Design an enzyme around this catalytic site. Structure first.
Site, PDB file in Angstrom:
ATOM      1  CE  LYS A  64      -2.690  -2.958   0.889  1.00  0.00           C
ATOM      2  NZ  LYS A  64      -3.659  -4.034   1.654  1.00  0.00           N
ATOM      3  CB  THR A  93     -21.508   5.419  13.226  1.00  0.00           C
ATOM      4  OG1 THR A  93     -21.206   4.392  14.102  1.00  0.00           O
ATOM      5  CG2 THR A  93     -20.228   6.207  13.219  1.00  0.00           C
TER       6      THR A  93
HETATM    7 NA    NA Z   1     -23.067   6.467  17.760  1.00  0.00          NA
END
Ligand code: NA
Ligand SMILES: Cc1cn([C@H]2C[C@H](O)[C@@H](COP(=O)(O)OP(=O)(O)OP(=O)(O)O)O2)c(=O)[nH]c1=O
Ligand SMILES: [Mn+2]
Ligand code: NA
EC number: 2.7.7.7
Length: 327
Positions: A64, A93
């Site tokens: 990478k 989230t």
């Molecule tokens: Na959350």
DNA sequence: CATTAGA
DNA sequence: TCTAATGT
């Protein structure tokens, strides 16, 4: 810090992506130590192989690097950056209460947007319901000017309730911070010390007051030691109402406040730094105590602290103002 | 790194 | 009981 920026940074992108969108805790663990080592790495990474030398760096991560060094970017972070499924998990989230697991499930059911979230308030539980309900407010910062009004009131009931009570607004606000995100009330009381088999009402009495007068508006989780909620400033002689802010109050056995307090008063750094030294000074400091160290490798024996000072002298140092505990 | 909701 | 989330 800057010599290996992107590297650690790309690394963290990759890792966070491994932990959230994918439930690959290992790879996730891969990227972190790695990103952690190239990080200590004292020189400009010139290639995969160079890096590759280090521990934590394998071939995949090495791989990478090269590409990142070569094309000033990365395919995967490109592909990933694009992908809604993941873009979505990154997003949902942000609602207090939604962790990744839930984030995933939501998406699966096809709950991608905030609006989605509303239409299914049913699927959500109290924390997350209140969570979405104050999505805006919870994402804003707490002007200190407000920090002070709040602190003002908290102390006041706390006191009206029982005078014997001690409160401390800790965290950044305590350390000067022009603004704060959530308020942190450290609370203790005489009656409550290491032994004295609790007195839950102690937490309880207070939580109520604050509600009675109308500062605490909602409850995320009340416990016998950590109540965790939402509060709000008395929308004045109207026009300007106040944003709902996250508040937190926790009881502490009076014989552990100061350390505790020293502690939540941070910063993360001044903290470690102090801890790392107390160590030299023949001690040990943690979220609750300060024990003299001893040569068999380890010891105990919890020294009695009456102020932030005591803890100071103990490791024999200069008092450090909150204002200046920056690191 | 512990304290809570929840199922 | 585990297991998720927050924080710190
Ligand atoms: Na959350
Ligand atoms: C350590 C530093 C603080 O004590 C505590 C973290 O409380 P946090 O709310 O996580 O952080 P903070 O108070 O430093 O930041 P702010 O108030 O601006 O959000 O742990
Ligand atoms: Mn804070
Ligand atoms: Na398990």
């Amino acid at each position: 810090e800057t010599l290996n920026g992107g590297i650690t940074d790309m690394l963290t992108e990759l890792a966070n992506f491994e932990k959230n969108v994918s439930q690959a805790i290992h790879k996730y663990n891969a990227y972190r130590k790695a990103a952690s080592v190239i990080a200590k790495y004292p020189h400009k990474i010139k290639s995969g192989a160079e890096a590759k030398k280090l521990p934590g760096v394998g071939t995949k991560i090495a791989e990478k690097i090269d590409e990142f060094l070569a094309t000033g970017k990365l395919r995967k972070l490109e592909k990933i950056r694009q992908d809604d499924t993941s873009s979505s998990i990154n997003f949902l989230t942000r609602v207090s209460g939604i962790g990744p697991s839930a984030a995933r499930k939501f998406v699966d059911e096809g709950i991608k947007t905030l609006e989605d979230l509303r239409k299914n308030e049913d699927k959500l539980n109290h924390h997350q319901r209140i969570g979405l309900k104050y999505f805006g407010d919870f994402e804003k910062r707490i002007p200190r000017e407000e920090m002070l009004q709040m602190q003002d009131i908290v102390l006041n009931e706390v006191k009206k309730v029982d005078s014997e009570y001690i409160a401390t607004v800790c965290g950044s606000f305590r350390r000067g911070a022009e603004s704060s995100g959530d308020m942190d009330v450290l609370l203790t009381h005489p009656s409550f010390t290491s032994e004295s088999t609790k007195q839950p009402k102690l937490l309880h009495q207070v939580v109520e007051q604050l509600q009675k007068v109308h500062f605490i508006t909602d409850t995320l989780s009340k416990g016998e030691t950590k109540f965790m909620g939402v509060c709000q400033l008395p929308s004045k002689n109207d026009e300007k109402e106040y944003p709902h802010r996250r508040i937190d109050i926790r009881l502490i056995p009076k014989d552990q406040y100061y350390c505790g307090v020293l502690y939540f008063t941070g910063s993360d750094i001044f903290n470690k730094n102090m801890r790392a030294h107390a160590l030299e000074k023949g001690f040990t400091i943690n979220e609750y105590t300060i024990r003299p160290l001893g040569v068999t490798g380890v010891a105990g024996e919890p020294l009695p602290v009456d102020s932030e000072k005591d803890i100071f002298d103990y490791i024999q140092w200069k008092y450090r103002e909150p204002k200046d505990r920056s690191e």
